[PDB]
Symmetry: D2
């Protein structure tokens, strides 16, 4: 049986006997994603170039507008906005959503894969909504995932029931369920990080990478891949296995990537797929945020690979 | 004034007083690229999944390019990554051009939705003999045209001819390649290096030292950043766009590198050179290598002249 | 605020305190219509003409398959199928769907507008599902409408709340609401029938048409339009006002159009928009079917026009 | 072998050893036709309806700008512009083009099939380019045809070599040759006019239509079809055979349809396909225009059908 994103979610909803609010929310986001995908693949560019005689801002506008009009949200956090957005009282629903509408776009000039990342929370206070409703640990996520605009557009959705991947068929504008209850490999053969920053690495990251290129057990070295776009690298980590690293060094003690709308959703996807995501000190999903725009170290991927990194981290103390 | 690929090539043709053969071939190629782009983006995948109750993409891409080029009436010899032997176009469909192409580069990893691409190099037949595989055995210096299609966040066609390098965005809403960057030139010097460092244990000592210089600059400047998509078209396009260096060098295990000379290395070297960049094997210019086999491998270091010169300084140090 | 067919039907469902079965049915149907649209507009036709070296059957398979897999239906009646299709027990839901998956495909060779027509009923008994579950008068309809594959693809949906029109944006594959709670003009200025068959006309049809062309008063004669594709002619009638006729004559005493999947859904759309739909003798919606493929005469559109037709009809009764 | 519009045209040009200028013109026109098809099918409508928070004018702007930028044209006559457009000297080429950028669009509110009609002449005079250069008889056309935005988008091209039909594959944005050297049927079985004007018909049209409905020879009566959109009506006539009529009437004493960019192109297509196009008095292609927006009555289609009407017209003087 063919299945689609809308139908899949709605059927998980009907089981949980939900009110439809989360289905509405995910439907609207699905809509914004298709619209972002379309702008990203350059439909309409001919008009900009004079046929008849901004992208990350468009992407933010689409997500922001679609989530507000879903009547399922109350607080909206985005990379694009300094403060949390509070949904006008009339359009207010029970969920908080933290998103990065066009992750990777600093390098979209070279047509690198880009993505939208999102994490969904239930609001915490009956008390009127605020930016504080967004300051929750990843452990509280109701759902999370990303759209990848790579060679094709895929939406990866993580929920209680697991992680499921939906391909956008642009002939019909529908997300088709193609990979079910996805689980990451126990151990992969690829590591992924900016090695250009070698000089600044933590000694525990230095020794780990050393172990990948020069294996102490005489096994075959890991390959290295690093697109420089997080959704792309993380997606490859899910599909193929291995490890993705954006770690802390003494110059950036809290990494560079953003906890709420980058590290948490990816860590939640990872955990639902049987993988792991650590900061080094603790699970990313355990960190309790105080700033919506705070940064986090992130090491994620295959369980045996992350545990291997953690054993080195522990050694260096 | 808005410009399209067809209009751009046609106009260059009139300046040169051409018969029209190269324009027809580039039009057919660009029809193929759009059909490839559509299949790569998964148009109609819903039918594979039972929406109403088959070919792999590299096979389909090969069939698309092959069939479109044959039917162009502009070609006589076709060399593809996918076929062990050169295809000799039947007599009724022959033109004067020899095309070397990789129909879907990087597709080995297309399961993770990595950027893929098409690469092509076009030669005029030299000999007056019946066409054969030898007609494809020309150094890169003889290229008439070369370029690539990148199926990335968007689909862009990068074309190199004598007039220089021009970048055409595919507008999927209308199926037209729109000229969006004209006569493109690479940075003199970049800040990104690109290789698979996972195989560092097998590097040539010159590569080890070069990479060491990038990560730990003796002149104490800021290090270079690192990127490696692991898809040649992706990596080479970023190098053109942002500058820096792309390396797939020879080593002890692989003394001729891995990438293919005719339909990966040469087209990309030609594009780099027409954009003011460099491309070397370490010992020679990529475009100067005379092939003896159509599926032969070359080492390739390419990118910003200052960055490639710096690799060559280190290379020379180690002989 | 932007609205889509899914978000819209779902708001209606929450209002009505529904389980969501009908929304699932309508989402599935929507997915089918997008796939028909793409096919009808000839996406991928290059592959049939050898670039790399039937539409009525496909349309039927798209609708049947999406409906079965909706878990919302139990009996499916199609123009294409001799007998009613009974859904497998594990896939059964509460609704009966009567449809014409590609109406007008007889002349698709000339690229005439084509369409999909559907009518949704609730199954009325707890019996084992059979053809008889489809033998309901149009008054029993829960929802009905049509997709028109015209210069654009539009979906017109009638429910208790009235008639709403959704444009398919092919860029993103969403049905966008563009006309809310539509009502037909009280009187139009267009008549629509095949005048080539005038020697077979009912003397009443003869006189009515005569009056439109040669009015007794000083009024301008009506204009004439006849696409010959029902969805196109009925939609122009909804949009512009006027009258559409496929009436009985001596040779065909029950007309040519099919009651369950052509006449009834259009009668329902017409009546929810404040229009009328008669066989000449009674409302189309009141006819009790005894056969799934039985024919009905239909005269429909603006009420002043249909009432005027009935006046002439009675004159000869 | 698969053929495309660009490749077909360019091969015809090489046979005739032409400069390439007519190819440049026709490529530019086809690009415009793809952008019109995309706008007409409502790509991007979601943005109009606020997802991120005029058609005939755009269609005009598309054909104008693309034809100017071809370097192939010197004088442009459009339905949308009161006067001929004189191409600036730097963009001037040898062809004059008369076109209707979106024909039938006054009724597009009901998603009626629309189309683009074009007629291409070589500038005949050696004078400075002026409106006069557009006033040549249709006999002088070098090429003509239409894009029909119907259930699918098809470009129909008439040149010296015959009539060729190319379907737009929207998945790849390419016009594919589907029907080669097209010839109309010698006699058809459908007649096509607005019979709402029956009161204004002169005796010849009246007798002819009466003949179609009540065949003197006891042959089968003709079917009637009238979309009310010329491109749709004419294309069906080309595809199925039969006859299309838009005669003069009280409101339109010189006919309704425009000679330069409606009647001439269609008459040219008809004639290259072995059909016929008449005003009643003379071939449409023989009319020598005096004014760019002037109207002509038109009767066109299958040769035996036009001949039969012409025997009737003769009877009535
Ligand atoms: N029926 C018909 C249609 C069209 C014409 S026409 O007058 O427009 N003539 C043609 O269409 N002639 C054939 C087109 S030839 S295009 C001339 C431009 N030359 C060209 O592209 N040469 S090339 O060898 O392909 C070339 C391309 C690019 C470069 N850089 C160099 C050479 C008449 C009748
Ligand atoms: N006019 C009309 C239209 C439709 C109906 S109906 O019978 O079909 N009813 C509805 O459409 N009702 C809408 C409310 S039920 S739809 C969703 C089921 N709930 C749900 O998804 N809840 S959830 O909280 O969002 C949820 C989502 C995902 C998970 N995993 C868990 C819960 C009648 C009349």
């Amino acid at each position: 049986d063919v299945n689609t994103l809308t139908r899949f979610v709605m059927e998980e909803g009907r089981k949980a006997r939900g009110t439809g609010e989360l289905t509405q929310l995910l439907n609207s986001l699905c809509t914004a994603v298709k619209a972002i995908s379309s702008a990203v693949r350059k439909a309409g560019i001919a008009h900009l170039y004079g046929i008849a005689g901004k992208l990350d801002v468009l992407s933010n506008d689409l997500v922001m507008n679609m989530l507000k009009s879903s009547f399922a949200t109350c607080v909206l956090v985005s990379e694009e906005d300094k403060h949390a957005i509070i949904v006008e009282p009339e359009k207010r629903g029970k969920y908080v959503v933290c998103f990065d509408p066009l992750d990777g776009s600093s390098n979209i000039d070279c047509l690198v894969s880009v993505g939208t990342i999102f994490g969904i929370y239930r609001k915490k206070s009956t008390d009127e909504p605020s930016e504080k409703d967004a300051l929750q640990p990843g452990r509280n996520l109701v759902a999370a995932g990303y759209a990848l605009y790579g060679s094709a557009t895929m939406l990866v959705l993580a929920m209680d029931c697991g992680v499921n991947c939906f391909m956008l068929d642009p002939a019909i504008g529908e997300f088709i369920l193609v990979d079910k209850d996805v689980k990451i490999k126990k151990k992969g053969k690829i590591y992924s990080l900016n090695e250009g920053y070698a000089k600044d690495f933590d000694p525990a990251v230095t020794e780990y990478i050393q172990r990948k290129k020069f294996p102490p057990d005489n096994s075959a070295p890991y390959g290295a891949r690093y697109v420089g776009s997080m959704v792309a690298d993380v997606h490859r980590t899910l599909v193929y296995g291995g490890i993705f690293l954006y770690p802390a060094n003494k110059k950036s003690p809290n990494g560079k990537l953003r906890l709420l709308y980058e590290c948490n959703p990816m860590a939640y996807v990872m955990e639902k797929a049987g993988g792991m995501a650590t900061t080094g000190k603790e699970a990313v999903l355990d960190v309790i945020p105080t700033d919506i725009h705070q940064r986090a170290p992130v090491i994620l991927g295959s369980p045996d690979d992350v545990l291997e990194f953690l054993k080195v981290y522990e050694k260096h103390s």
